[PDB]
């Protein structure tokens, strides 16, 4: 039954986020940096798996797979800077924001031809577990469902080089892996398509409710 352990079921790594960055000539800063609030609910397959429990706790392993594509004019050598901003810390909003050189944040530099970047994160919440579901409300009595203690921080990325920029595309697949997993209070599996993040909503406009249950003509014939 070893392969049926939580560690085996949830501990597998998957692509939780695709991050694309394109060199833009107009302004140096522009919106060249990319910021993403870490969330494992974006991928349905991954979501349904975790939503099999009410509360989960685990450490993380982030692996980054950079994919550079040069349309033309070389620009082969470019240095990438991936940064992790902890929960509550201010996120960058310009390619040259101070956040990029702050020491409270964690950054990893990657130049093509280098091994894929990788680092670990400990259990981040202020609570003892992450909420897969939340029958509660905000302090303002709004945005019910989402939990503030569940914040996991942000993954940021900026092109560090300066002018060698010749309009090149950067694809960064982000792989996450739950380590030392623990779960509480199993729930029935999700039976319908997801429609919103942080909401169990299932009703879709102008479409009938469709389950996994396949109907048969007569119950006397299997």
């Amino acid at each position: 039954r070893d392969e049926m352990s939580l560690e085996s079921f949830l501990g597998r790594s998957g692509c939780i986020h695709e991050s694309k960055l394109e060199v833009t000539l107009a302004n140096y800063n522009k919106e060249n940096f990319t910021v993403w609030a870490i969330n494992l609910q974006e991928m349905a397959q991954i979501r349904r798996k975790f939503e099999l429990f009410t509360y989960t706790r685990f450490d993380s392993e982030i692996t980054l797979v950079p994919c550079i594509s040069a349309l033309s004019q070389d620009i082969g050598h470019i240095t990438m800077q991936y940064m992790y901003v902890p929960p509550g810390a201010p996120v960058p909003n310009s390619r040259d924001d101070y956040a990029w050189q702050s020491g409270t944040n964690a950054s990893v530099f990657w130049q093509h031809g280098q091994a894929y970047p990788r680092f670990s994160l400990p259990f981040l919440s202020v609570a003892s577990a992450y909420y897969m579901f939340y029958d509660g409300y905000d302090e303002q009595d709004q945005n019910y469902g989402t939990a503030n203690t569940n914040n996991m921080g942000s993954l940021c990325s900026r092109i560090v080089t300066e002018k060698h920029i010749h309009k090149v595309h950067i694809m960064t697949r982000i792989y996450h892996k739950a380590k030392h997993v623990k779960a509480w209070c199993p729930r029935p599996p999700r039976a319908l398509e997801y429609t919103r993040a942080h909401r169990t909503n299932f009703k879709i406009e102008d479409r009938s409710i469709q389950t996994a249950i396949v109907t048969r003509p007569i119950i006397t014939t299997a």
Binding site: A127, F133, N143, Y144
Partner: protein, 248 residues
Amino acid sequence: IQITRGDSTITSQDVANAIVAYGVWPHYLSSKDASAIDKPSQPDTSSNRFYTLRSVTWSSSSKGWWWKLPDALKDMGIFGENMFYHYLGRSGYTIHVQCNASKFHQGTLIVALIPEHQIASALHGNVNVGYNYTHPGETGREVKAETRLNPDLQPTEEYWLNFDGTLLGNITIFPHQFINLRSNNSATIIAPYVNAVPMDSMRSHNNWSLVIIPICPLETSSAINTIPITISISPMCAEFSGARAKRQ
């Protein structure tokens, strides 16, 4: 037999063939798990008694009902006041569901206690459930066909989807008990506090959610063709913190 707890006492509880949610018995917050180091003490048997809600009517067309805890007891004497005059609180419960019927009635109920039962909104689009509707109080929430207000605030009515996108019939993964009229006529669940933190704002977060779905429709040849479902809830090891002045 009868379980007399406090100044309240409910007859017909009988033997102890009840279910103990997740196998854990309601307990007082241990100092090791406590949030603010430890509190000198929290012993108060005052809120530990039976609050019996009004009996709901089970008819041949009833699709379901659900209450949320602690919400349902927000207006029940001591417990209600306690949770209103304190910032934080935690509590377990002893839900007791029983209905009066005869050997000439047939039907079956699924009585489940769901942790973090996050409801899904009725409409499509970027809508969400509004505070007022997930906090119906002791009145509970009945599955109705009639149209209601702030529709985009209303929760779903799809009971067979557990009100949250899962399949009824898998709802058995939660602590529950079936009530097969021809066998038993009551169920009992003793649930401990469940959350990712020691205590919480009882006002904003409903830990448990009591659901009751008629899996097998009620049928009978009696004059009145409906029977009553009586619900008695009793707080277990209730604890509170951050007390504020009352009657002000």
